[PDB]
Amino acid sequence: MFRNQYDNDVTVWSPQGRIHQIEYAMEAVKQGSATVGLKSKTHAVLVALKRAQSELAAHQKKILHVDNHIGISIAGLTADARLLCNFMRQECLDSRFVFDRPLPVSRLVSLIGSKTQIPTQRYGRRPYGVGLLIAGYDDMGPHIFQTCPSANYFDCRAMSIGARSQSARTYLERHMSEFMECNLNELVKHGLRALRETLPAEQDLTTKNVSIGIVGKDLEFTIYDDDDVSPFLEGLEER
Amino acid sequence: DVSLHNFSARLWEQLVHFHVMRLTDSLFLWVGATPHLRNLAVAMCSRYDSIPVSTSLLGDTSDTTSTGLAQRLARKTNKQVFVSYNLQNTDSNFALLVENRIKEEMEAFPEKF
Amino acid sequence: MNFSTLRNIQGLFAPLKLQMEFKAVQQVQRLPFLSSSNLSLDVLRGNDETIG
Amino acid sequence: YSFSLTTFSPSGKLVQIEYALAAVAGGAPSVGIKAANGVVLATEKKQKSILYDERSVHKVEPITKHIGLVYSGMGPDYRVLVHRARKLAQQYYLVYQEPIPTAQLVQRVASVMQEYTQSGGVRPFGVSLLICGWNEGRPYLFQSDPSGAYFAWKATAMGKNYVNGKTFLEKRYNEDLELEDAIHTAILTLKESFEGQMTEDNIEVGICNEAGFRRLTPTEVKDYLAAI
Amino acid sequence: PLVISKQKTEVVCGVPTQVVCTAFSSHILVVVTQFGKMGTLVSLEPSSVASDVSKPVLTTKVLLGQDEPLIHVFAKNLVAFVSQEAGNRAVLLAVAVKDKSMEGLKALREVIRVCQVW
Amino acid sequence: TIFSPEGRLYQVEYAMEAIGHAGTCLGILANDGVLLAAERRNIHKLLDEVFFSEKIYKLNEDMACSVAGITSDANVLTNELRLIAQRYLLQYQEPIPCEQLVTALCDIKQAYTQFGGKRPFGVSLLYIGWDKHYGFQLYQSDPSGNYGGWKATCIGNNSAAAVSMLKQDYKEGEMTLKSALALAIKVLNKTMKLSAEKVEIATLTRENGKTVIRVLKQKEVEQLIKKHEEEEAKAE
Amino acid sequence: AITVFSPDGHLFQVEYAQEAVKKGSTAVGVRGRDIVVLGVEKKSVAKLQDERTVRKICALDDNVCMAFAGLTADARIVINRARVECQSHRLTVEDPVTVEYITRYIASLKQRYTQSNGRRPFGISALIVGFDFDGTPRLYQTDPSGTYHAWKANAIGRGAKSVREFLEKNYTDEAIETDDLTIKLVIKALLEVVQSGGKNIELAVMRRDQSLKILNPEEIEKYVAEIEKEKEENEK
Amino acid sequence: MFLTRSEYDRGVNTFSPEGRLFQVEYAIEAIKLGSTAIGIQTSEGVCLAVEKRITSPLMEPSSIEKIVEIDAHIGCAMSGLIADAKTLIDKARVETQNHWFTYNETMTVESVTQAVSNLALQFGEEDADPGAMSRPFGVALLFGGVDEKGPQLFHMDPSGTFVQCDARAIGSASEGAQSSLQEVYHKSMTLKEAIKSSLIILKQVMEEKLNATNIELATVQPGQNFHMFTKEELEEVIKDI
Amino acid sequence: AGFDRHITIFSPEGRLYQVEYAFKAINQGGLTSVAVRGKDCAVIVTQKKVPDKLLDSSTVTHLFKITENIGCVMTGMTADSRSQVQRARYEAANWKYKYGYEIPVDMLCKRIADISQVYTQNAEMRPLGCCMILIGIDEEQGPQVYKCDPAGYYCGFKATAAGVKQTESTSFLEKKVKKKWTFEQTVETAITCLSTVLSIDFKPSEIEVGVVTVENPKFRILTEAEIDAHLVALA
Amino acid sequence: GTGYDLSASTFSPDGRVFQVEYAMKAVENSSTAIGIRCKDGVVFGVEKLVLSKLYEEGSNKRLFNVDRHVGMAVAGLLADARSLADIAREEASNFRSNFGYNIPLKHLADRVAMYVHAYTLYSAVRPFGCSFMLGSYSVNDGAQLYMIDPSGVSYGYWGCAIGKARQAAKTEIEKLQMKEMTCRDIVKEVAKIIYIVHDEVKDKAFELELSWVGELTNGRHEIVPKDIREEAEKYAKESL
């Protein structure tokens, strides 16, 4: 009842000590489909889900390639995702082109957070409305990172974002004790099983609504789509 | 090569300066009274339209002097023309005087345009 | 004595405050209108008692 | 008895200008008289306590060799306007190689004042100015309102109880008035409704002649007060 | 002349190149072409939300041409010092170069420095 | 700066309504001249017989104008008119046409109702002048930027009655300076008791190829009002 | 604020500008074989006003004409801009402009004012007629949103729908056989909303290799009388 | 326990409690007032068909252009407010011509797409001057061209981003047109079949009668250039139905 | 919306309520300052309060050194006072660079007041809630005491006060000045005025004293031993 | 303060700015953190709540390393704290580059406090919503401890506490004799206070974060070794 005067601008503090526009922006992440990310001792895997509509009307790019050792998955606003992807690509390309060495994932994530914090304090601007999952490999090994519209980032062993990702999160929490010793095949199987939990009790994974991105040691970032996901899909059991 | 030319004239109660840079089938023209650059446009002759295709690169979208001047110059010279008109006079006939002076300089020194 | 010297002597806040004041005062600006006198801008810039 | 959020009053005038005039009318009294040869400006400089230092700030200020002014209203606005007036006079002298006429300076100051009544995010000045000058062997006296509307007068007053001062001036003005008699009349007008004892330190007097404009030393003010 | 300009040509990495610099009170115009024509047009401006306003970060925008990260990186690393040494002034760059490499950029930076007008 | 749902400009309407409370001005065009008549709302005995809110300004040697509105805005607009006329004269070695001057001012007036975030000028004008293109002329203006030519018009307070009486008692091609002055005095008396010290009269004419602009004296105004009183007494 | 979309996908300011246009006087244009006719009805006439300064039909160039309906100051600004553009094109390209060229310029200028928050739409509609170099008559219409089309006959203002229905019913290849028939058709179309007869009709015509011409009230009355007499002859 | 008023659709930078941009949604909804357009891309080329509605017999049909030619290998179809698409069309033409004039190659469809999309997202830019565009464009586009990657088809909406597609329909009857396209499109179909299917769907959805004067049709092929059908070709194709 | 929520809107009686609220914000601190000018010296005395026992008392002060020959005491909001002090130092440095000699006290006060005046005529920024008192010695005029306010008004005084109990302090000082000073008498007068107004017997660690003298024109801050000696001499 | 609390450029009728007060209230919904200055060093302690088991250990740190010799503990909005830490790092690096020696903690605190205060004057920005403390040690300067709040006021302290339960923590700290103790006892005291002022029912399980800078570390800010943390936690649990 009393929230009317304090929930229209991002530069207005509520008498309770809150900013409602940031929470509203964070609410926009759940408007996209679900994504799952997990890592092992030597590999990092991203698994995404495509929209249930027909593929004729639109082709969706859910998993994007940033560098030879970094890849991301998006859920939220397409324009914000495009802006962030361009920023990350420019940063990585500048690092390589100048210093002839790859850019650390932690440094990249810190730069992203610093850039995204700015519009939450100025007048006449709005926060970014997209969420990111970042998978990379560097001298310290595999990495999984999560980004928030509130300019917060976390270091994760496994995480899921999107619409109705609570079941996937519960599965990941339940089965997280055996990810380290798994190889690539079992890791992708675990990711697919976690992603399947966000579907109704009768639907099943298909080659036309699954995308996979894999990075790891002695293997650059690669995206598998359409008929390329058949070897990974084969071997899965009934729900 | 690239050639540079510079001239000026007094219109009404102001001194107006003109700067011309000539390239290979290209032209850049700057007009103003103070050393400022806030407008820019480009026009080219195309076979898919009767008016040369043009677009605005910098400045306010409510000012059409640069666009029209670039279009007319591109039609006359059959080149790619960049025009930066920075004069800030509300009178609409002052641009006619500017265009007449530009034309006069054009027949005066045809090799620099 | 300029922005770099002020930053090196006092800190990052002083030039930021000066530029925010300049931008806030300069909001009275429009092209298709008549000529204007920048009284507050000259007072803040400190050149309200000298002729250029 | 009435507060309005509109732009134009029901009488056909700007509301903010009326409020600024109301602010002006609450200031200290000022008196200006034009004589046969010269103009005299006077004002009340009553201080709240003996702790003040009268030799610190002044209300009568010279613009150039032959122009001075006094105000009635808010001090800081007068201070910010005086510097601009001096700068305009210096610019005119530099450009035209001749002293600026009084009318031109009044016009430019009025234009500057009017500029602030149209833009957004600003407020009008809360002062009214009396300007005196000497050109071609002929004295001048002008008064300007916060909105920038100026008129030429022969005798006028503003501030507190300005209607009684205007009545007094109307009753006791002559076309062939001399400078000494003009000074005496101005001091008498100030003495009218003074609610106190007038000394040579709580009032300011400035005069303009063919030799220029200058502010009177307190000894001269005491000598003038001795005659009354 | 209300605007001051300088020009000078050389051969960089075996291909001829022309450099022209023109100074305004709000922009610096730098032309580096190997075809004799203006190709990609890039605008570099100081950021308006920079915390360090004495040495602010630069924002790169492509006005006409192909939009790639390499273009942004090349433009920034080529005219950052020109922007900095001119008193934090905006730079308008028109570049048409066949191939882009760090050695070519370092070679062209000296030619740009020789034609200083700021 | 914002269209009403019915397609109207509230700021312009408010400015016109505010002007509707100002002083009354008159303009009558004759066969050999044109005159302006105004009402002196404020008067004091201590004014300095110059800059005494003289409502009839002089733009050039050929033109003059009258104002009903805000005095400071009127001063700004008149000053701009003077610079425009001087600049055109310097450029073309020829006096500016009256219609061109009116259009030049009206463009500035109209720009403020479309651009920026500033309020429009609350001033109405009345122009009189002579030029070789059309001779004696009389125009009018309003804050919205509209203008038009007239033969007899009035702006300010109680202008509707003045216009009605002018259209009732005005005949084209048969009136001279004396008849125009008498009609103006009658209309002003009806629309305002009138005193000879409460009005200002200015006239424009040609004297051997030279425009002459004069302001009627107090004695002349007293003579005119005495003649009007004699005529109205003889009528009854 | 400006540039705000309605829930059903409309710009509020453009609709309000069109509402303002709807209150203007009616204008009718008809394209013939070798003549173009424009006609505007007069909303009100004051006997003290000069008719030269309130005309709603203007000539942009030697072969282009224009009529408008809506606000007058905005129309004046647009007309001045179009005239300057035509003069500049002639001076630079040493070729006459075309009707489509000037129509596209006007439409682009109108559209540019619906983009930013610091401006407001114009709020006028225009009808443009003329002849090309090869000798082809043209007729175009523009609206405040920036849309333009080509027509054989059209109307704007009050009663526009009724006049459009009348023109659709009565426009045939045998009704534009001659200039007199075309003028009679325009007058008949305009008389469908005017109740006072031919005294409130302003008419102008343009012929091939000829300048703009304005018909006199005597000619208008003669045409009206001929149309009426034909009406009773048909009615028997 | 009181019912109060609350609105979130006043500005373009305001989020609703559920995380939505109502101004952008309204700009997208503005496209429903336009005519229907259909675009199909096959292994042999791209086919574009649009409906033009004439609101009065006094109007000139030739004055309505809803299919334009960006270059010798790129075409476009509009739906919505035609006055808004002029800037985008001019920008695309200028970019393509400038690239050819400078380098003597042809831009890719993706490059022209990015160049156009940079301008359509001017609202919401970090340092956009107030004198530029401040609202989303009220028009949708359908780009079709042939590049070294083969035929391609792209779609844009007032949101400001392009998305690749295989068979897309826009306009007022987009739902029915897409429903019809779903059961017709297949990967092995040819250009003539695409033209026939698009014409059949247009006839099904149009309220008026298909008479080869109220429609437009164009195709792009790897061998030939952009081609727009004439009256005789349109009549010959329609008479097959 | 409203005549008191806008800094650039006059009230029907011609008042600016935001400036009055800024004046009221000075009393939020709860302290009082007194400045007294002598024959050849100037003395500023302020009240020190350190209630928390976990707070380092060496970091709490209100006396500042603008220049080697100019002192200052601030009353009001702490952050605003510190920002004002930094701005004053910057202005003094700029004046020295531009004109080749040290800025006078009256000129510095005038510049500060001119800066403060702009905040009252624009709606996008607010005035600072603090009051500044400057002391110094002129080459050809002697000791000088100046005072500022949020409204932009400044004047010179023989004795002045700021903060709470300002009216009582002025009433006390008026009688002494009218009755009618050596270096010892100025400090004693200031301390006696503060003590009588506050109705508290002072301790050497409860006040701060800063002085300037013609013989030694450099601003100096007294130590606790010196303050205790002065208190013993007074009592 | 209704009607005067929508902007930071507005004064209340009693002379208050309510946006800054709301910003300072925004710190009270964050977990508490304390810092105690000792005879030969400063010890920090943070009560950190666990969000989920899917996060790696060592993420979402609230004890930063501003430089080689400065430690920082934050409370409130995390992004604002990170930006302020970046600002502090930039200031320290600039001072090192110019003057050639390590910046004193007083100057760094003053610069950061002025930067924070710069955001409480205009209506185009909003005040920061975080508080933090700085700690340092030197052979010729001893131990230093400072606090900066959203209003922009900095002071030196002997014992400080920020967060949700700062009042109870301050009351507990007031009973200590830290002026004569050592770090090896201050760590246990900090652990005991953190365990005491924690709410078991309202908040779920938590973890304890500890650090010092002092003589035994030779002027460096580091993390407490695991054995010392375990001993301190055992002592706190057995005392509680």
Side-chain angles (χ1 to χ4, degrees), chain A residues 74-161:
Chain A
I74 62 170
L77 284 174
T78 309
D80 298 342
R82 171 192 201 232
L83 279 167
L84 288 188
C85 196
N86 281 342
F87 173 79
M88 295 164 77
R89 277 177 182 141
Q90 287 170 30
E91 293 305 310
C92 287
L93 181 50
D94 173 272
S95 165
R96 269 206 209 271
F97 186 81
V98 174
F99 304 102
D100 203 349
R101 54 152 180 268
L103 189 68
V105 191
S106 305
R107 179 80 185 144
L108 182 72
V109 175
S110 298
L111 290 176
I112 295 164
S114 173
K115 180 206 171 69
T116 48
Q117 193 263 329
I118 294 283
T120 60
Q121 204 150 11
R122 302 316 207 104
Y123 178 93
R125 295 193 68 178
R126 64 156 175 94
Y128 291 78
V130 76
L132 300 175
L133 286 177
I134 301 153
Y137 193 92
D138 65 334
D139 305 341
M140 325 283 306
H143 293 297
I144 298 281
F145 280 98
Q146 187 214 339
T147 313
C148 197
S150 64
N152 263 299
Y153 56 91
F154 314 89
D155 201 349
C156 297
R157 306 165 68 169
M159 186 56 70
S160 187
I161 59 158

Side-chain angles (χ1 to χ4, degrees), chain F residues 32-91:
Chain F
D32 52 339
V34 59
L35 60 86
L36 278 156
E39 154 193 358
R40 184 176 177 87
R41 186 179 295 275
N42 59 71
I43 186 165
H44 309 255
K45 197 181 74 174
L46 289 175
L47 274 158
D48 202 1
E49 67 183 1
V50 66
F51 295 98
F52 54 100
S53 184
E54 201 194 38
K55 214 178 283 189
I56 297 89
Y57 311 87
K58 201 200 274 213
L59 294 174
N60 296 115
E61 77 272 31
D62 291 331
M63 293 177 71
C65 74
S66 161
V67 167
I70 314 295
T71 315
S72 45
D73 295 334
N75 290 316
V76 171
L77 294 177
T78 300
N79 189 359
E80 199 56 40
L81 278 157
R82 279 177 191 125
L83 281 71
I84 291 162
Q86 293 179 356
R87 283 203 295 261
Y88 183 96
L89 169 58
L90 207 42
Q91 183 62 75

Side-chain angles (χ1 to χ4, degrees), chain B residues 1-2 4 6 17 19 23-24 28 30 33-37 40 57 82, chain E residues 1-3 5 7 18 20 24-27 29 36-38 41 63 92:
Chain B
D1 291 331
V2 172
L4 296 155
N6 189 358
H17 298 96
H19 178 253
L23 288 86
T24 301
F28 173 72
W30 176 90
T34 70
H36 281 80
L37 199 151
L40 191 66
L57 310 175
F82 298 80
Chain E
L2 204 69
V3 294
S5 66
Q7 62 179 93
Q18 315 191 47
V20 189
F24 298 91
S25 66
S26 50
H27 289 259
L29 174 60
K37 310 158 169 168
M38 289 154 92
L41 194 63
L63 307 177
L92 189 65

